[PDB]
Amino acid sequence: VNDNRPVFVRPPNGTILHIKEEIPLRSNVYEVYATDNDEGLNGAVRYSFLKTTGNRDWEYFTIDPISGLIQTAQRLDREKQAVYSLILVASDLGQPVPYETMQPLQVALEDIDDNEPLFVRPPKGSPQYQLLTVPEHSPRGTLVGNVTGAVDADEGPNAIVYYFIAAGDEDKNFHLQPDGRLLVLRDLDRETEATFSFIVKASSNRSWTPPALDLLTDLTLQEVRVVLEDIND
Ligand SMILES: [Ca+2]
Ligand SMILES: [Ca+2]
Ligand SMILES: [Ca+2]
Ligand SMILES: [Ca+2]
Ligand SMILES: [Ca+2]
Ligand SMILES: [Ca+2]
Ligand SMILES: [Cl-]
Ligand SMILES: [K+]
């Protein structure tokens, strides 16, 4: 007679497992262990995921029915999905029906630095540069505006974004702070030169410097255009 139900020993109920994202196929994740103190088959334990809920996170993993080893079955990308919900099942092999026990388990992916700062180009047809405007004859240091649009898909210190002029301001009309603040250096006159164009690099490298620059293919770059607003002078 099948007296005992299997009892999970590991993991503990409600534990959130933390693994690195982007670990290769069939990487080892966890050793599940449940015990059953019954005689022979009534006390043999077999491991599975529950696959009958609407939650299909089980597709990312396998569990060995005998050893309880969970391995990865697919790419684990934290930027695609950060948390994965599994329901562990431990079954004995009882007479016409086994007793089974279930234990929810969450797996959370720790971020790695596998993305760089990238712009997204305005839709085809509309101008491909970020536009900034300043009054002509603005004094030295005047905020022209904030260059922006570059995002790093990583987390915290893996997602630092800095902006740098890559090319196009040989006259030193502007200074670009690494935070994206674009400032006036020189006296700018609408009635002489009313428009400026140059290229900015977004980088996580605080000490990036210019080294051939293709704005169609390289989304770490964008064009910035500055126009001077009219003063009555
Ligand atoms: Ca049993
Ligand atoms: Ca990733
Ligand atoms: Ca990054
Ligand atoms: Ca990442
Ligand atoms: Ca003027
Ligand atoms: Ca004017
Ligand atoms: Cl204007
Ligand atoms: K402005």
Swiss-Prot record:
Tissues expressing this chain: In adult animals relatively high levels of expression are found in testis, skeletal muscle, heart, eye and thymus, and lower expression in kidney, lung and brain. Found in the sensory hair cells of the inner ear.
Domain Cadherin: 11-119, 126-233
Domain of life: Eukaryota
Localization per Swiss-Prot or TrEMBL: Cell membrane
Record: glycosylation sites: N13, N146, N205
Clinical condition linked: Defects in Cdh23 are the cause of waltzer (v) phenotype. Waltzer mice are characterized by deafness and vestibular dysfunction due to degeneration of the neuroepithelium within the inner ear.
Summary of the function given for this chain in its UniProt record: Cadherins are calcium-dependent cell adhesion proteins. They preferentially interact with themselves in a homophilic manner in connecting cells. CDH23 is required for establishing and/or maintaining the proper organization of the stereocilia bundle of hair cells in the cochlea and the vestibule during late embryonic/early postnatal development. It is part of the functional network formed by USH1C, USH1G, CDH23 and MYO7A that mediates mechanotransduction in cochlear hair cells. Required for normal hearing.
Comment field on protein domains: Three calcium ions are usually bound at the interface of each cadherin domain and rigidify the connections, imparting a strong curvature to the full-length ectodomain.
Subunit structure: Interacts with USH1C and USH1G. antiparallel heterodimer with PCDH15. Isoform C1: Interacts with CAMSAP3; leading to inhibit CAMSAP3 ability to induce microtubule bundle formation.
Name this protein carries in UniProt: Cadherin-23
Residues represented out of the complete protein: 2604 to 2841 of 3354
